[PDB]
Every structure is written in C-alpha cells, then in structure tokens.
Motif scaffolding. Structure first.
Motif, PDB file in Angstrom:
ATOM      1  N   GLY A  23       0.832  -1.187   0.000  1.00  0.00           N
ATOM      2  CA  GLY A  23       0.000   0.000   0.000  1.00  0.00           C
ATOM      3  C   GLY A  23       0.866   1.236   0.000  1.00  0.00           C
ATOM      4  N   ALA A  24       1.871   1.216   0.867  1.00  0.00           N
ATOM      5  CA  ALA A  24       2.818   2.305   0.968  1.00  0.00           C
ATOM      6  C   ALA A  24       3.711   2.325  -0.262  1.00  0.00           C
ATOM      7  N   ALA A  25       4.259   1.161  -0.621  1.00  0.00           N
ATOM      8  CA  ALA A  25       5.120   1.063  -1.798  1.00  0.00           C
ATOM      9  C   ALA A  25       4.466   1.742  -3.002  1.00  0.00           C
ATOM     10  N   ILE A  26       3.351   1.175  -3.453  1.00  0.00           N
ATOM     11  CA  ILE A  26       2.614   1.729  -4.584  1.00  0.00           C
ATOM     12  C   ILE A  26       2.365   3.208  -4.377  1.00  0.00           C
ATOM     13  N   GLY A  27       1.907   3.586  -3.186  1.00  0.00           N
ATOM     14  CA  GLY A  27       1.672   4.992  -2.923  1.00  0.00           C
ATOM     15  C   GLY A  27       2.886   5.818  -3.253  1.00  0.00           C
ATOM     16  N   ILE A  28       3.992   5.540  -2.577  1.00  0.00           N
ATOM     17  CA  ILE A  28       5.235   6.251  -2.838  1.00  0.00           C
ATOM     18  C   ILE A  28       5.437   6.386  -4.340  1.00  0.00           C
ATOM     19  N   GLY A  29       5.001   5.357  -5.065  1.00  0.00           N
ATOM     20  CA  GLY A  29       5.110   5.368  -6.507  1.00  0.00           C
ATOM     21  C   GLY A  29       4.106   6.306  -7.144  1.00  0.00           C
ATOM     22  N   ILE A  30       2.875   6.291  -6.635  1.00  0.00           N
ATOM     23  CA  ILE A  30       1.831   7.161  -7.168  1.00  0.00           C
ATOM     24  C   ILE A  30       2.045   8.597  -6.702  1.00  0.00           C
ATOM     25  N   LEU A  31       1.954   8.788  -5.395  1.00  0.00           N
ATOM     26  CA  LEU A  31       2.148  10.089  -4.784  1.00  0.00           C
ATOM     27  C   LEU A  31       3.520  10.647  -5.135  1.00  0.00           C
ATOM     28  N   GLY A  32       4.549   9.805  -5.035  1.00  0.00           N
ATOM     29  CA  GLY A  32       5.895  10.248  -5.352  1.00  0.00           C
ATOM     30  C   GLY A  32       6.067  10.560  -6.824  1.00  0.00           C
ATOM     31  N   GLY A  33       5.491   9.717  -7.678  1.00  0.00           N
ATOM     32  CA  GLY A  33       5.597   9.928  -9.109  1.00  0.00           C
ATOM     33  C   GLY A  33       5.035  11.269  -9.540  1.00  0.00           C
ATOM     34  N   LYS A  34       3.923  11.668  -8.928  1.00  0.00           N
ATOM     35  CA  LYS A  34       3.285  12.940  -9.258  1.00  0.00           C
ATOM     36  C   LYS A  34       3.876  14.087  -8.441  1.00  0.00           C
ATOM     37  N   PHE A  35       4.384  13.769  -7.254  1.00  0.00           N
ATOM     38  CA  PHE A  35       4.969  14.773  -6.372  1.00  0.00           C
ATOM     39  C   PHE A  35       6.076  15.548  -7.083  1.00  0.00           C
ATOM     40  N   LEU A  36       6.975  14.815  -7.731  1.00  0.00           N
ATOM     41  CA  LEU A  36       8.092  15.424  -8.446  1.00  0.00           C
ATOM     42  C   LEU A  36       7.606  16.361  -9.548  1.00  0.00           C
ATOM     43  N   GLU A  37       6.588  15.931 -10.288  1.00  0.00           N
ATOM     44  CA  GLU A  37       6.038  16.738 -11.376  1.00  0.00           C
ATOM     45  C   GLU A  37       5.798  18.176 -10.928  1.00  0.00           C
ATOM     46  N   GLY A  38       5.485  18.346  -9.649  1.00  0.00           N
ATOM     47  CA  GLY A  38       5.247  19.673  -9.116  1.00  0.00           C
ATOM     48  C   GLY A  38       6.492  20.259  -8.481  1.00  0.00           C
ATOM     49  N   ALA A  39       7.264  19.406  -7.815  1.00  0.00           N
ATOM     50  CA  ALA A  39       8.486  19.830  -7.158  1.00  0.00           C
ATOM     51  C   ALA A  39       9.558  20.217  -8.171  1.00  0.00           C
TER      52      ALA A  39
END
Length: 79
Positions: A23-39
C-alpha cells in the motif's frame, strides 16, 4: 477453527503486509511519481523535504505492518 485459524492469521499478515508494505510502496510510486512533477518547478530544497516525507512515509509504513504480519505469520508456523 483450527483450520480457519491459519486462514485468518495467514491471510492477516498477507493482507496486512501485502496491503501495507505494498500500500505504501505503490503509494510512494503514485504520490511520489506525481509529487516530483510539481516539485520539479521549485528548487530541490523545499519540495525535497516534503518529497522525502512521503517517499519515507511509505517506506516506513511497511516495516511495521510487515514486522507485524511476520509475527502473526510466525504464529501460523507455530501456534
């Protein structure tokens, strides 16, 4: 009981660690994947802080749910 026990317990650490560690793994992938797009727009000083907070927020969410599933699972191995 004695049979559905291993089913509940096992499925407990499989559903717990599976859904957690992943749940966390995938999240980090989802949330993290999009997080950078903004960062990416902002420097790697401020967003790097939140970016890590999330990547870790997930990488840490498994260790517990997993250690717990590991324990309950250990029980399945020996009641």
């Amino acid at each position: 009981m004695e049979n559905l026990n291993m089913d509940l317990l096992y499925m407990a650490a499989a559903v717990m660690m599976g859904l957690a560690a992943i749940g966390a793994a995938i999240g980090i992938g989802i949330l993290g994947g999009k997080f950078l797009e903004g960062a990416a727009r902002q420097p790697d000083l401020i967003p790097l802080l939140r970016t890590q907070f999330f990547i870790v927020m997930g990488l840490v969410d498994a260790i517990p749910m997993i250690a717990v599933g590991l324990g309950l699972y250990v029980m399945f191995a020996v009641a």
